[PDB]
């Protein structure tokens, strides 16, 4: 299996034409001429009894619902969320100081690390300057500040992913006794592994931070608007 052999210059236009591609593919010498399991039978198991039982499984349904909706009308390409495309703004390169706008943090300044497979850009300001763990944040809820730090070769744990950062609930009790789920008081003590693998990235973001003259005082601070300070008059 060769590669595409026709590089797209613009989205969905090949660089080579129809007859230019008949020769790049050598189509002039490859025109061609040459030209269910329902169920294995189950055995008898019995006296006065033969005929290893007939081919039947996955039988007809017990109950047809009284009415049904018709089938849908097929549409083109509306592929689910695991398959669309992932995008960034050009102002957010790895190493960018971000400004969180909307969380529980609300103005804490963090360091952008890696853009995950879901568009949620993984980020941490360190836990010693801020109080920000390795949280995901959404892309369009930050502000890319025009200062950077080179963290191009920091390290990255492969185990931290979209499946790593999730939230969990498992509804066992169907009875309306007065427990609050019996385990949603549990602020998460799964931190025992999360406390290990932030130190494995804290230890080598901070020497990048401590090499800039006063960048670490800049990350303890929070962002605010005060009196004559207007965005659109402002350079972030």
């Amino acid at each position: 299996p060769h590669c595409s052999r026709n590089p797209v210059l613009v989205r969905g236009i090949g660089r080579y034409s129809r007859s230019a591609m008949y020769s790049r593919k050598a189509m002039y010498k490859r025109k061609y001429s040459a030209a269910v399991l329902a169920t294995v039978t189950k055995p008898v198991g019995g006296d006065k009894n033969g005929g290893t039982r007939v081919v039947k499984l996955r039988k007809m349904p017990r109950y047809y619902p009284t009415e049904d909706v018709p089938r849908k009308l097929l549409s083109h390409g509306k592929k689910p969320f695991s398959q669309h495309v992932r995008k960034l703004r050009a102002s957010i390169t790895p190493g960018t100081i971000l400004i969180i706008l909307t969380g529980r943090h609300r103005g804490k300044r963090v360091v952008f690390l890696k853009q995950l497979a879901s568009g949620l850009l993984l980020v941490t300001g360190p836990l010693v300057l801020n109080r920000v763990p390795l949280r995901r944040t959404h892309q369009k809820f930050v502000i890319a500040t025009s200062t950077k730090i080179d963290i191009s070769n920091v390290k990255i744990p492969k185990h931290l992913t979209d499946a790593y950062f999730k939230k969990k609930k498992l509804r066992k009790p169907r009875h309306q006794e007065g427990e609050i789920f019996d385990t949603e008081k549990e602020k998460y003590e799964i931190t025992e592994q999360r406390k290990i693998d932030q130190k494995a990235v804290d230890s080598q973001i901070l020497p990048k931070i401590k090499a800039i003259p006063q960048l670490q005082g800049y990350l303890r601070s929070v962002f605010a608007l005060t009196n004559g300070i207007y965005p659109h008059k402002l350079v972030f």
């Binding site: 210059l9 613009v10 969905g12 236009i13 090949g14 660089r15 034409s17």
Partner: protein, 51 residues
């Protein structure tokens, strides 16, 4: 009614020549651009090699 002039491949259902008219005007305005960027260099290059 999806719009011609705004998406491709509706034009190509109405006009197949619209695609080959379109990469011909993308191939040439890339080589008219590679010519003019190099020529604007080619004056101030030896004008700097003078200085």
């Amino acid at each position: 009614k999806k719009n011609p002039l705004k998406n491709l491949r509706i034009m190509l259902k109405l006009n197949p020549y619209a695609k080959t008219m379109r990469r011909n005007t993308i191939l040439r305005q890339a080589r008219n651009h590679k010519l003019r960027v190099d020529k604007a260099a080619a004056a101030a290059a030896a004008l700097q090699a003078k200085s």
